[PDB]
Design a binder for this molecule. Structure first.
Ligand SMILES: [Zn+2]
Ligand SMILES: [Zn+2]
Lengths: 115, 151, 59, 67, 244, 50, 260, 82, 148
């Protein structure tokens, strides 16, 4: 009667943006990233990678509601830095880490398959 | 199905305006099963939060000015305490005094009456949980709790 | 158990909503509810529920 | 009424273990040793094979609707 | 409290110059010691508080000070201490005459009954009586000097808060206090239990009261003795036999 | 203390005297109240009819 | 302010499970990888059934839902196929689906066990796991003399978040800090608890001492595959999938920054 | 009743406020003239509430007394508490 | 400088009333330069303390070696000269009570300043000549360093 489609969690709706940036007015150099059709899989890795950046004063994620499949990520950086730049570098760093982890896994698989 | 009825309910029967009841001049709705047991184990003296966990909690605060508080421990590792976060949850600059369920009767007479070893004798000052373990007596439906004083 | 109603069928004897999901009936605004809304002082709501939303009529 | 395909908890295939499980029990094997030989270590999968009731075998005792 | 403690706790001592010099500043202490009209105002306040003291004894014959009132003065005073950063160790700049004059002016601003006629003024004096008593006993000149130690700005804000907090606690016209009372009395009836001496309690006892019954289930008396019979058991038994 | 005799000592303090009281199974106020050594001020009952 | 330099050390690799260890990485990266193994790894599974005849004691929905949970070999085919959402074809096609067929009838007196071996596919690469050339064949339904079961199924590409049938894992034993050094847990009686298989401690001890400057590292894994994807392919497909989401997310980000 | 000496309370009751916001919202809903400015509000409720806080509601409350008299108290003469 | 009190204490007892918590312990200490008793609660998990130890306590209103008030906010991106680098254990709290033996006429000779470091309570009682900078509702630090 009301069971929502399962693919509605990952597929973006027509006319809906994958990510929206809203400048926070409470404190300076802060932004809120409202990403649609995501879950804790991405919020945590981006959160953790953001904390490791010393120019990031605040980095957190939340799910407004589990039934929804969106996520909100708050990023506060130093005046000399920018939050959007941190969200970008955090992704670029994660991509390189996975690329390195991927290559090092093939080698381990190859070394194990041979002997 | 009318603006009059809509406005009437919006000013007389809403939940916020119905927190305190004239039946017993005390709140009827209070903290509940999980939020009451965890808040007890959250405001304890041996509860320390790291830089990562705090940012996760503060992110769920609507009444947050966006300024992280100076932790109660800056070295050797920056650690926030549960009471240091609850102080941000408590609004305004209210003042209250309660007693934990395990508050012994032979404590307010002898020494340590203002510095409790078991972290009893809840004391809120200027909207900050100076000390104490919160329970139903401080957040439940009892009279004079932090909620009744908040309303 | 999910049930909803908005301008549905009505009985024959009294022009009030039916009773039951099978008949698309409405929910009962019993006496205890009349007493509760009386305490709130909500007269318009008590009027809209018992007169305008149940069985309005002109004579 | 019939052995499921996957385990509700983990997702391990169990549909191919019922017949083998019965073939072992009749061989004087214990329910535990039999589940170990099939590769069921987690108590979640072992639950599916040890708590299942083969009711389809009783539904097949009734003649069908068409011959 | 006893008469001695009540005097030592509420009577402003304008004789000990050393104490006042610690509680009050230099300008205020010399005015209290030199001026005599002020010393009479403080003495009249203590007498007015002593009259109220007996009014409470006849109202509360039992030692039960727990009372229900609109505004909590102890908390508003505490809130004022933190809002203005009051130092309980430094002398206060609050003239005790401003405390008395402020309380008297405040009691007039709390109007449960509107009207200057003697009939309305008596009801207003009797309506805000219990509050005006708790007000004069908490906002006393002495307590505000050695216990709370509020300043001039903090006191003015305190009065404005009591007036606003009180005017908001007044019953609003149209409030259906009838059903509000039946629900407040019927709600606990669903939680209470259905079932020396056996006494009927709970719904059965609540029932028999609302529907006055000429044959209750457990009717009983509460006999109190007057003199020696109230202390000894031999004479009391004689009275028991004279009733049983 | 709700049934004791709460008096006011000469010093101004509340004193709860432990005095004997009788609890009956019936209700006869007009006769019980009119008895010697019985307090005609505090003696009451639960039968609101009487 | 940069990425880590993680390492890997495989302690066991088979056709069913793979046990590896990741070091010098954050707990979030290790957890998300665990979530991808279950919920963000594409795989082929039945998602469409058309019952032409079913005289068995099990209704259609019981069989359809049962067919979906049958694992299909999708090692190299899932990467070539496309999602029905992105495909420009009709309801079905060979590029976005794999057609199946089933035709069984119990003519003899003995009970006929309709198994996955009867599922005839048009693509020889995508076939039931048990049918891949020990393990027995999956049991779909039993038939009585005179009963018949004939249908025409179609498989599609999907992942776990849509349905559990698209989950290639049969258990992901994620563990870190076997010895409670970081004290993330608080054993009221550490002596009453057992030792982890990855623990390095004497039997006389219960848990390692506290490490204030310690960080979650050396995450252990055991990816037991259902059979469709090899235990190693799940990891590679997982990291590539998790790397694709971040890549697409980075593109949408740049699309929003330049627009602002 | 002498309007110069009105014995009723000077504050607006929660019920008087409710009906005022309601009745005023209906008028605005019927495309009635607005008394105060509006930034982007389109709901008659938010419009009526701002009019009360601004104290620019053209309505008179006829407080009936038990004896039969009545007192006409304007929304501008009453003191809003909540 | 911004220092409200400084002395060397010696732990005389730890949790006399019994161990109430796990990651926290109550220390009963006494000084020698001023003879000021001290009851403090620290996190023995990250800063273990054994009976008989000796540490230097410095109650300060700010961490910057130069006189400058703090903003009460957590800003780890601050390279200013802080006196915390010279110490091991540092806490942040506020004064919520200042007791004494003052009478109706005589001033206070002995005081007892109470501080709360986000739940961790401290009681420093001694001579009033050493506790003049303490005022209620004032932010202070600890600057505790263990020495041999
Ligand atoms: Zn399982
Ligand atoms: Zn296609």
């Amino acid at each position: 009667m009301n069971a929502p489609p399962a693919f509605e969690s990952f597929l973006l709706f027509e006319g809906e943006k994958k990510i929206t940036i809203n400048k926070d007015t409470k404190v300076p150099n802060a932004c809120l990233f409202t990403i649609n059709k995501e879950d804790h899989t991405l919020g945590n890795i981006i959160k953790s990678q953001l904390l490791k950046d010393p120019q990031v004063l605040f980095a957190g994620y939340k799910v407004p509601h589990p039934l929804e499949h969106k996520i909100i990520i708050r990023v506060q950086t130093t005046p000399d830095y920018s939050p959007q730049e941190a969200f970008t570098n955090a992704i670029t760093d994660l991509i390189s880490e996975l690329s390195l982890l991927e290559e090092r896994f093939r080698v381990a698989i190859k070394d194990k398959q041979e002997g | 199905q009318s603006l009059e009825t809509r406005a009437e309910i919006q000013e007389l029967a809403m939940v916020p305006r119905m927190i305190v009841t004239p039946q017993s001049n005390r709140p009827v709705m209070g903290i509940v099963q999980d939020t009451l047991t965890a808040v007890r184990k959250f405001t304890k003296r041996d509860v320390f939060l790291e830089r990562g966990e705090v940012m996760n909690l503060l992110m769920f605060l609507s009444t947050w000015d966006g300024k992280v508080p100076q932790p109660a421990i800056l070295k050797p590792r920056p650690l926030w305490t549960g009471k240091q976060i609850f102080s941000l949850i408590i609004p305004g600059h209210i003042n209250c005094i309660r007693t934990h369920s395990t508050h012994p009767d032979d404590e307010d007479s002898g020494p340590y009456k203002h510095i409790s070893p078991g972290d009893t004798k809840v004391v809120v000052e200027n909207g900050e949980l100076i000390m104490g373990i919160l329970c139903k007596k401080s957040l439940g439906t009892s009279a004079g709790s932090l909620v009744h004083i908040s309303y | 158990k999910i049930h909803s109603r908005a301008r549905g069928p009505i009985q024959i004897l009294n022009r009030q909503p039916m009773e039951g999901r099978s008949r698309d009936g409405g929910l009962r605004f019993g006496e205890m509810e009349r007493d509760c809304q009386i305490a709130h002082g909500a007269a318009q709501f008590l009027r809209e529920r018992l007169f305008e939303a149940s069985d309005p009529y002109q004579v | 009424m019939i052995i499921p395909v996957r385990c509700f908890t983990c997702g391990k295939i169990v549909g191919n273990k019922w017949e083998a499980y019965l073939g072992l029990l009749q061989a004087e094997y214990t329910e535990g040793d039999a589940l170990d030989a099939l590769g069921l270590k987690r108590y979640c999968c072992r639950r599916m094979l040890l708590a299942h009731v083969d009711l389809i075998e009783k539904l097949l005792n009734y003649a069908p609707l068409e011959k | 409290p006893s008469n001695k403690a009540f005097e030592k706790k509420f009577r402003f001592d304008y004789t000990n110059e050393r104490a006042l010099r610690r509680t009050l500043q230099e300008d205020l202490v010399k005015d209290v010691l030199s001026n005599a009209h002020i010393q009479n105002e403080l003495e009249r306040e203590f007498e007015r508080m002593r009259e109220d003291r007996e009014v409470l004894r006849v109202i509360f014959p039992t030692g039960d000070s727990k009372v229900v009132l609109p505004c909590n003065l102890l908390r508003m005073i505490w809130n004022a201490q933190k809002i203005f950063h009051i130092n309980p160790r430094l002398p206060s700049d609050l003239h005790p005459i401003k405390v008395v004059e402020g309380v008297k002016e405040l009691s007039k601003k709390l109007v449960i009954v509107n009207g200057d006629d003697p009939l309305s003024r008596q009801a207003q004096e009797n309506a805000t009586l219990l509050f005006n008593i708790h007000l004069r006993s908490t906002l006393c000149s002495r307590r505000m000097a050695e216990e709370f130690r509020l300043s001039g700005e903090a006191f003015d804000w305190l009065l404005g808060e009591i007036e606003s907090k009180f005017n908001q606690a007044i019953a609003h016209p149209g409030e259906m206090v009838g059903a509000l009372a039946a629900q407040s009395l019927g709600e606990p009836a669903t939680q209470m239990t259905l079932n020396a001496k056996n006494v009927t309690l709970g719904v059965p006892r609540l029932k028999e009261l609302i529907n006055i019954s000429k044959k209750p289930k457990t009717p009983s008396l509460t006999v109190f003795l007057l003199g020696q019979s109230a202390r000894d058991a031999e004479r009391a038994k004689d009275i028991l036999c004279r009733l049983e | 203390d709700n049934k004791k005799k709460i008096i006011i000592t000469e010093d101004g303090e509340f004193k709860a005297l432990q005095e004997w009281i009788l609890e009956t199974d019936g209700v006869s106020l007009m006769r019980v109240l009119s008895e010697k050594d019985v307090d005609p001020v505090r003696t009451t009952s639960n039968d609101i009819v009487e | 302010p940069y990425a880590n330099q993680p390492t890997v050390r495989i302690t066991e690799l088979t056709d069913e499970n793979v046990k590896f260890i990741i070091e010098n990485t954050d707990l979030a990266v290790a957890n998300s990888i665990r979530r991808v193994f279950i919920a963000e790894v594409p795989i082929i599974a039945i998602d469409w059934v058309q019952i032409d005849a079913n005289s068995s004691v099990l209704h259609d929905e019981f069989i359809a839902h049962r067919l979906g949970l049958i694992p299909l070999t999708s090692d190299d085919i899932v990467d070539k196929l496309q999602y029905s959402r992105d495909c420009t074809c009709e309801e079905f096609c060979p590029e976005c689906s794999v057609e199946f067929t089933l035709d069984v009838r119990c003519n003899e007196d003995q009970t006929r066990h309709v198994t996955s071996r009867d599922l005839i596919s048009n693509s020889p690469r995508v076939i039931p796991v048990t049918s891949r050339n020990e393990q027995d064949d999956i049991l779909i339904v039993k038939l009585r003399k005179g009963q018949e079961l004939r249908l025409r199924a179609y498989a599609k590409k999907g992942f776990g978040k849509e349905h559990a049938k698209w989950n290639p894992t049969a258990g992901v034993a994620f563990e870190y800090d076997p010895d409670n050094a970081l004290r993330h847990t608080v054993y009221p009686k550490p002596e009453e608890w057992p030792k982890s298989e990855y623990s390095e401690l004497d039997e006389d001890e219960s848990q390692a001492p506290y490490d204030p400057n310690g960080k979650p590292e050396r995450f252990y894994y055991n990816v037991e595959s259902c059979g469709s994807l090899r235990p190693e392919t799940i990891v590679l497909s997982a990291l590539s999938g998790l790397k694709k989401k971040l890549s697409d997310l980075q593109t949408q980000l740049s699309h929003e920054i330049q627009s602002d | 009743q002498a309007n110069q000496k009105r014995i009723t309370t000077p504050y607006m009751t929660k019920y008087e406020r409710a009906r005022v916001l309601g009745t005023r919202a209906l008028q605005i809903a019927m495309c009635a003239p607005v008394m105060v400015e509006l930034e982007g509000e389109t709901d008659p409720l938010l419009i009526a509430m701002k009019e009360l806080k601004a104290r620019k509601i053209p309505i008179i409350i006829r407080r009936y007394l038990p004896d039969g008299s009545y007192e006409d108290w304007g929304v501008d003469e009453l003191i809003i508490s909540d | 400088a911004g220092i409200l009190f400084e002395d060397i204490f010696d732990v005389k007892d730890i949790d006399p009333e019994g161990k109430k918590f796990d990651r926290v312990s109550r220390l009963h200490c006494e000084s020698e330069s001023f003879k000021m008793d001290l009851i403090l609660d620290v996190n023995i998990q990250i800063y273990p303390v054994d009976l008989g130890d000796k540490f230097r306590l410095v109650i300060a209103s700010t961490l910057y070696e130069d006189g400058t008030l703090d903003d009460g906010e957590y800003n780890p991106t601050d390279d200013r000269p802080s006196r915390a680098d010279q110490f091991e254990y540092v806490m942040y709290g506020k004064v919520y009570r200042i007791e004494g033996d003052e009478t109706s006429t005589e001033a206070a000779t002995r005081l007892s300043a109470y501080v709360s470091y986000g739940g961790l309570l401290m009681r420093l009682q001694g001579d009033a000549n050493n506790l003049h900078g303490f005022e209620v509702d004032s932010r202070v630090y600890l600057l505790m360093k263990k020495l041999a």
